[PDB]
Amino acid sequence: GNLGYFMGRGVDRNLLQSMRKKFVFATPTLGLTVKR
Amino acid sequence: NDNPGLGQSPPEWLKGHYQTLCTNFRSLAIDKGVLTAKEAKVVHGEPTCDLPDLDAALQGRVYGRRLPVRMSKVLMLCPRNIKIKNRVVFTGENAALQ
Amino acid sequence: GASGSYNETDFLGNFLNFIYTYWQLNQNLLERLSR
Amino acid sequence: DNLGSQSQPGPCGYIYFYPLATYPLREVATLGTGYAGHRCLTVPLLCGITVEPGFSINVKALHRRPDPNCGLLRATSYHRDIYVFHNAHMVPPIFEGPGLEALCGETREVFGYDAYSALPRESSKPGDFFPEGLDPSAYLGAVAITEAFKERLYSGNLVAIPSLKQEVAVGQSASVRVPLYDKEVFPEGVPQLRQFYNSDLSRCMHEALYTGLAQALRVRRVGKLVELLEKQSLQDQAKVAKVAPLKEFPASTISHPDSGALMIVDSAACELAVSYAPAMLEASHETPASLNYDSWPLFADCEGPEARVAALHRYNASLAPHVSTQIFATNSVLYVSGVSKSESLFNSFYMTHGLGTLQEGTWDPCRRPCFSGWGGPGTNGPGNYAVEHLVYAASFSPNLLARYAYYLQFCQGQKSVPETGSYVAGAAASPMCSLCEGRAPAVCLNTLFFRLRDRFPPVMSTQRRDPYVISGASGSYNETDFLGNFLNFIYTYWQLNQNLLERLSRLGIDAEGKLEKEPHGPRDFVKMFKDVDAAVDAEVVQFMNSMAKNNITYKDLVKSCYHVMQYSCNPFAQPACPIFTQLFYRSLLTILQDISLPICMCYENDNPGLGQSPPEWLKGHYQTLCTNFRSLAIDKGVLTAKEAKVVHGEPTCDLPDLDAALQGRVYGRRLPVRMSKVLMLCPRNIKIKNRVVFTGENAALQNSFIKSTTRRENYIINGPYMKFLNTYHKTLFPDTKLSSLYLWHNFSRRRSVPVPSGASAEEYSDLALFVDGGSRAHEESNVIDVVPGNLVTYAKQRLNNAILKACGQTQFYISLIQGLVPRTQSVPARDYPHVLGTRAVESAAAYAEATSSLTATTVVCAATDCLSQVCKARPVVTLPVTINKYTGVNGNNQIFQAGNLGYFMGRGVDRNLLQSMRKKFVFATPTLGLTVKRTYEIENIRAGLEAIISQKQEEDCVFDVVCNLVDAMGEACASLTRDDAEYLLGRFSVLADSVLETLATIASSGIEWTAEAARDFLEGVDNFISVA
Amino acid sequence: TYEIENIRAGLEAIISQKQEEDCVFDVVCNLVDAMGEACASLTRDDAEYLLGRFSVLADSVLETLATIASSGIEWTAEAARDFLEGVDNFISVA
DNA sequence: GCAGAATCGCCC
DNA sequence: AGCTCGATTTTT
Ligand SMILES: [Zn+2]
């Protein structure tokens, strides 16, 4: 399962223009729903 | 490719082949680099267990019985993870990418 | 969806994850930075 | 691309006709299965004696015309055996003993086996299948058949077309062939009597081919096995279950707590062997160089027919130990009794052996009574192996039994008894013999049986997990030097051994350890060894430097090394004997069953029997089980095979008009063609493994492997030099009365040595100290349990003891494999009564008189100390195997297999086996120099000069170059020109003027041209500043 | 056991005990006792098996049996001794 | 009585 | 528009 690219210009402004940089969206759960 | 369609519709072709194709999938999909899962047998220890008398409970009367019990299914397929990979180093070998 | 417990996402990924390990090397550096 | 795609269109088989006036009838009889009174026999397929040179063993067979304008093609190889059916009485028998056909018939009935049942038609008359004008009385007739259509030959469903005759040379003899086609090439039909049938041929195939395949599956109904193999070939039934109804089970399986699961696993293993073995046998095969009879090296010194027949008899004696091992061994493939259940989980089902089990009554797949059993019977007495057990081993076939008896006639007797001549004139001549009536007492099968009596195995009824014994040709790549497959690829261990043989060549020693110059005396004997020790110790350094600079983990790679042998899966690679057809086919069927056992167990654990009979359970499950087997049996550590697609290039091909040819008219047509099957499963090798290093981890085993260090008294006589000290005894101690053993044992206890009458004392004091020193150094360092017979084995032992020390392997002996190699010898015939023939014998005095002038050929086996040189000669092999099954590593859940080398059972097999964990045996006969064939001087002068100049340091080289030229050319140096000198000096051609100026001083000073005089003249006839 | 195992055991029992004398005549007498006239054609492959651990002795045994065969005495242990027993420098080492 | 092993190819 | 990779467990 190789990590790929997002399609569509509406997804996020940080994706608006590469081989050598890829992106993931992440939200943490420690300190929200699970205790440290 | 080994068992061609020969103008059959998919429901006709699956009638003969699908039971074999299930066993190929279980052998070739799991632990081969994306999906991991563990097979297990499920067992119950006691030959009877403490349960409500469902015939009395349907008529509004509540009391216990030690009903004889057994499993209707024994095999379980516990899923674990799907694995995502990304290569770190470009080695210069593919001359179109450099 | 939810992520699993064991992710390898430092700069060299799964390099020397088991056999000192790259995980131990990063723990050593954080201890020096604590001093 | 592949050998199947490349094969040409052709017929389903051929009838060959050979002229009786010129054909070599006594030669073919030595390779045949002829018994006295035969009407048919088998012979091998060979170019230049049974088929013409350039015979194609692979073909596309034209087998069906769906209509008169379309052909279908099946890709198939030929069957290995040829069946000789017309005028067969003209071929001599291989064995002279009478009465075998009735003995086979009686014994087949008591074991409950199916006899051949003839068709209601007569056999085809000669005028139906002979070419036009040939006389049937003048020719010998035989069939060659393709592996896919041999059941159609048996069942009378082929058509012969005499108008399509072809004239062919078979050795010297002007021969003819006629093609065979399946009756399905005639869609409008041909009359039932126009088809080809011979009842003696079909009966011969029933007994010599199909009955042994039925025995390998534990089936009694042979005719029903032939019918289901035919329909599997013609109607594509490979994924349909078919043998389960014919199965039968013993009381140990019926009484078992897991009996329902055992009956399903035993049945499914047999179904899979019947699906896959015919497919692999029909596949396209490579053509070996051993298939060409006129290039066989064994004939090279022969003059005339008698010398050629005597050379074939010596060839047969070299194969006999393979055949007699399969009779004498309790765990022979011929005595496999079925499947039983316990061992670890994947080993819990296993193959069993025992003749006692094979005599018992049985039950059918629905638990009803089936065969009722046999109570047993002779001269070997009650409960012991009898002549009926030998008839059972030979598949109740008089053809096979005759060739087994011929091989047993080479074996020595081993008494645990009347003298041979008082047995032959006495009880062998009794009118009570059911074979000879007493009228052929010296050759009778009961006389041969009486002679070999104490070598036959015991009769067993137990269910233990033992290895089974297999026979056949070896593959191309065997790894059987002392560390096996250690560093086979990446320098490699193969390259290291090639480097050592090159150093030993510079010392005057060849690859078999023969010297170009034998040692003259004590100094020369010490000098010979010190040079080999220095040459080995130099190569250890260059090797250890390579392992170091590359950071290779050689110290852990030693722990996991194995010996490896390849068992070949090509039927044409086997030796030219019809018994090896049965041994190969039964070895393959047994290995496919043993591989399938855990695959069937795991599928049945997921899909339980629930009181179903195996034929009911297989009806739903078998198609899925075929696909599991194909995925899990191949490339998992024992069996290798390659799948391929077969394609034909042209849309039409040049073929005869078969409708015109049936009416006698011959002309060509371009018939449209397509393949009837596309998939082919090409078999490659079965792989046998043995572990080299014991690591001390299993604490129960250590006492078998542990290395002692204390100073023994036997250290010289059990040391590395004793065989050489014996070989050279008459040169070391001229005319001494002492044995070499006593001389060196006296030295080992009294510290004294004898000095010959004119020889010098201190020279012998040095010889003694060399022997003492090296023997104590060997006692300390050695972990290879061998006393070496030749300088190559001595050198290779020294080398491998060095590598094991660098790996820290010092506490234990390593495992060894030893080869047992046949040696053929002529002996006085006194105890070998078969040399007298069918002769009547009237008294013991006449037996003694008639044998007094006669000799018999016999065979014994000798132990080699060096299996790897035997494996270079592409040997025929016999060995024991167990197939062990285990889980993968690193969390994997798949099953992997190893075929592990085991042990022989039964005290009659070979005297070298009579008493280990740490030594195992294989029987081997080489084929190079039997059936397969094995610079300018100015280049050698040039190489020897570049070898001097590249090494000479701290001295000027011109005198040592001039001496090498005067040695190699002598007086011819006196006119050596500059153009010749520059060529000989090679890279160093700048030296030429100084060489020629030096040679002129030898020429003009008037000394003779020899290296001794050159030094005596030259050696009779500076400022140096240092630079920054 | 086979009789060839018992001959082999009896020879290893002699050779492992015989001290301060050369053993070839006592081995040859035990063979002539156990095999008689059949010694006259004893091959090197048979002799090496019977000598067991001490198979190095085989050439000297066969050279000795040829002298009994060619001298025309009968094959018995009494005659073998009567022929053989009718038909040195030594430096010490540190 | 009589080890243990994830496997394929490559062939100098 | 957007590498190549025989795979599993181990688990800090
Ligand atoms: Zn008889």
From Swiss-Prot, chain A:
It is found in: Virion tegument; Host nucleus. It comes from the Viruses. Homooligomers. Forms double-helical filaments necessary for the formation of replication compartments within the host nucleus. Interacts with the origin-binding protein. Interacts with the helicase primase complex; this interaction stimulates primer synthesis activity of the helicase-primase complex. Interacts with the DNA polymerase. Interacts with the alkaline exonuclease; this interaction increases its nuclease processivity. Plays several crucial roles in viral infection. Participates in the opening of the viral DNA origin to initiate replication by interacting with the origin-binding protein. May disrupt loops, hairpins and other secondary structures present on ssDNA to reduce and eliminate pausing of viral DNA polymerase at specific sites during elongation. Promotes viral DNA recombination by performing strand-transfer, characterized by the ability to transfer a DNA strand from a linear duplex to a complementary single-stranded DNA circle. Can also catalyze the renaturation of complementary single strands. Belongs to the herpesviridae major DNA-binding protein family. This is Major DNA-binding protein. It comes from Epstein-Barr virus (strain B95-8) (HHV-4). The gene is DBP.
